[PDB]
């Protein structure tokens, strides 16, 4: 009875503190910045071979190797320049929802509704790809996994918790609690010190890996958050939700900066990604196409409309010379 | 091109051949989703994710039992959904109706038919014959309900259980008829804990669904 009033007073204090710093907006300082203009992109490669909807995709560090996952139960490694396949990895379960590529190029990870994260070894003397370890301990389904090094991995699940794992021993070292809904997407900072998690409670939190404590909590969305991206400089968020709205958050002003929306968009958002310079913001939609946004102006620069179904995957290479998309029509496309 | 690129092309061709070979076997199995609340008797209708397999008339089936707002999206390619309701608990029928409404009007299931099982008929008959609990205590509209003249009760059944069964079936069906515009159909069924013919009903309903899809594909409907 007494703690609710204290919590409300603290929330009001935080709200008053945030309002005091709103001395300017992006829409006002950017009046002296020229628009990016019209951007045209065309299909350069088409990747065929999948027989089911594609759910996950991730780029390598060499800008040539690509890994994709689909509901047919197989994991395929692609060579983007020649379209040749390198590996084909059978899965123990066909309900896969995420995939990842190790920064050293030696390991690949995947998971899904089986509540287990599996790590594969791509470089063996026998020539075959083999399973190295299965990570168990979650109670809900696994939605995303990201590598920190060859021995640490961060996972997010639908049981409102996040975890940091030790691959050598298979034990959970840190548990992140505080969410009230299923956790959808993760984004790892370039400095490998902080990560961001979105959830179905229409909120986003910033976590400290080294201590396991939540630092800041952001609100504003009206529905579930499906994708989160990280600005290259480490000080901004990019989030999407099912209410057809994209938002930009700052970690130093502790409030929202810009809203990306349009009256003709009434569908959900599935993926968000950035360019190298951060000027372009890419987003996937359920309208069977992908839009190109101006991060500093909230305008529309172009559109990619080569898919016949929902777009579920989106990524940009480390050198910035290609953009890859995935859809439920079992096709992958490389744009330039 | 170099010889190594030709060898890589040969490896890619073999990988493509192996991918193509595997796809043929996958398409010969029909997939079903099983949903229901506790005490409904889901595990006995055909007796992270639990799986079961059965075969009727040389046709293989694969049924999945998960454990709903998020993981339902990946089951939009299944042939049919199986829903089991306990018809011998008046206190919890409104929850079943709300769940059926929430599943029927889901935007990702707009093209998937539902097979509805109304289970535990013997307990309902015993409770109706005993007269220690009345439907009118929870459903006021039942006092004005009359058995339709086109009813086909099983021989020997007292004309007091047919009224209750048809009332429950009507209450479940009326939700299905309010929306859909013909894109999917509901198939009500009455079953019990001891019935074994349940396997044939799924086969017949799936054959009917595939027939409907084939009729629609040929510009006949």
């Amino acid at each position, epitope marked *: 009875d007494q703690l609710r009033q204290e919590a409300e007073q603290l929330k009001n204090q935080i709200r008053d503190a945030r309002k005091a710093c709103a001395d300017a907006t992006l829409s006002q300082i950017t009046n002296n910045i020229d628009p990016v203009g019209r951007i045209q992109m065309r299909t350069r490669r088409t990747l065929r071979g999948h027989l089911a909807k594609i759910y996950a995709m991730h780029w390598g560090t060499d800008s040539r190797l690509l890994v994709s996952a689909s509901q047919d139960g197989k994991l395929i490694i692609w060579d983007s320049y020649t379209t*040749n396949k390198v590996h084909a990895i059978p899965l123990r379960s066909s309900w896969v929802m995420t995939c990842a590529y190790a920064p050293s190029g030696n390991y690949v990870a995947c998971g899904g509704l089986d509540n287990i994260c599996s790590i594969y070894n791509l470089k063996t003397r026998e020539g075959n790809v083999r399973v190295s370890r299965e990570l168990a301990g979650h109670t809900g389904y696994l939605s995303c996994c990201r590598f920190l090094d060859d021995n640490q991995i961060v996972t997010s699940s639908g049981d409102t918790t996040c975890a940091l794992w030790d691959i050598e021993t298979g034990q959970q070292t840190t548990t992140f609690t505080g969410h009230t809904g299923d956790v959808m997407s993760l984004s790892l900072a370039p400095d490998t010190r902080l990560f961001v998690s979105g959830a179905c409670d229409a909120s986003a939190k910033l976590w400290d890996v080294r201590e396991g404590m939540c630092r800041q909590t952001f609100t504003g969305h009206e529905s579930d958050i499906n994708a989160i991206c990280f600005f290259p400089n480490g000080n901004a968020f990019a989030t999407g939700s099912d209410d057809a709205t994209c938002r930009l958050f700052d970690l130093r002003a502790d409030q929202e900066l810009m809203t990306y929306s349009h009256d003709n968009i009434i569908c959900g958002i599935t993926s968000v990604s950035f360019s190298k310079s951060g000027r372009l913001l890419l987003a996937g939609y359920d309208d069977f196409n992908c839009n190109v946004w101006d991060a500093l102006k909230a305008d529309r620069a172009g559109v990619l409309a080569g898919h016949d179904n929902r777009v579920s995957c989106l990524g940009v290479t480390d050198d910035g010379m290609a953009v890859a998309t995935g859809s439920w029509d079992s096709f992958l496309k490389i744009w330039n | 091109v170099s*010889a190594e690129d030709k*060898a*890589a092309a*040969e490896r890619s061709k073999m990988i493509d051949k192996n991918l193509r070979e595997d796809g043929e076997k996958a398409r010969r199995t029909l997939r079903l989703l099983l949903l229901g609340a506790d005490n409904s008797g889901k595990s006995t209708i055909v007796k992270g994710i639990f799986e079961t397999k059965f075969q009727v008339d040389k046709v293989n089936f694969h049924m999945f039992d998960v454990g709903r707002r998020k993981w339902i999206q990946c089951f939009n390619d299944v042939t049919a959904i199986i829903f089991v309701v306990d018809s011998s608990d008046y206190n919890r029928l409104q929850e079943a109706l709300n769940d059926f409404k929430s599943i029927w009007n889901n935007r990702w299931l707009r093209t998937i038919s539902v097979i509805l099982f109304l289970n535990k008929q013997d307990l309902l008959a015993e409770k109706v014959l005993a007269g220690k609990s009345k439907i009118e205590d929870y459903f006021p509209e039942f006092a004005r309900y009359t058995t339709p003249e086109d009813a086909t009760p099983e021989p020997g059944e007292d004309p007091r259980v047919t009224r209750a069964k048809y009332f429950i079936r009507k209450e479940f069906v009326d939700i299905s008829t309010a929306s859909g515009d013909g894109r999917h159909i509901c198939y009500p069924h009455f079953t019990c804990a001891v019935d074994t013919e349940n396997a044939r009903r799924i086969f017949n309903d799936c054959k009917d669904i595939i027939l409907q899809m084939n009729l629609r594909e040929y510009n006949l409907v």
Partner: single-chain antibody
Amino acid sequence: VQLVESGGGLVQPGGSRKLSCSASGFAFSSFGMHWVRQAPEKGLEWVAYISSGSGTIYYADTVKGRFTISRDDPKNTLFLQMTSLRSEDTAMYYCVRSIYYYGSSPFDFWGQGTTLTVSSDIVMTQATSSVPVPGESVSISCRSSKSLLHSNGNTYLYWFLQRPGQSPQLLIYRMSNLASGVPDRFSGSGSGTAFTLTISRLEAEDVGVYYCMQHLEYPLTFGAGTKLEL
């Protein structure tokens, strides 16, 4: 990972004999296979190659019409059929494992070998018979008749080391890639038709003959060999 060869013996001119190789410890069906022949005073010579899927087969210009190579995946065995043997065929035969994809190492493992006793090409040139020489730096050079640099950015030069009584071991592939299991004392560089091999610090195990090989076009060619005497 183990390869064992069998067969061999003494034959008369005009006869025939069949060789076999038993593979174990790896996925034999995913690898391509080569046969390499070495004479007492001639060096290494390429004989034949068979793809993993039995798709393509190549033969040397001195063995066409007389040698036949076959594969048996279910038994993990190789066969080489030889007919109308001549006096020039008396030499050691080795079996080599190969796999080709982006980033692979196509000449990583060599067998032990068996002995058989009877009774346009790119020229790879080395010229030194013996380099007298622990702790010192040694440089070995190779020269090719035609440029080994392809338009795709890859240059196909390979280095091998043969210790006394041991099979050849891979050191460097594609001129800058250090093979697994090799200490970091070895390095290599070059451009066009000139290449060099560098050893930072010699030990007692760095004694042997070093060979150069190109992989641009068939047939494959080897160098004369440079012997390092400590």
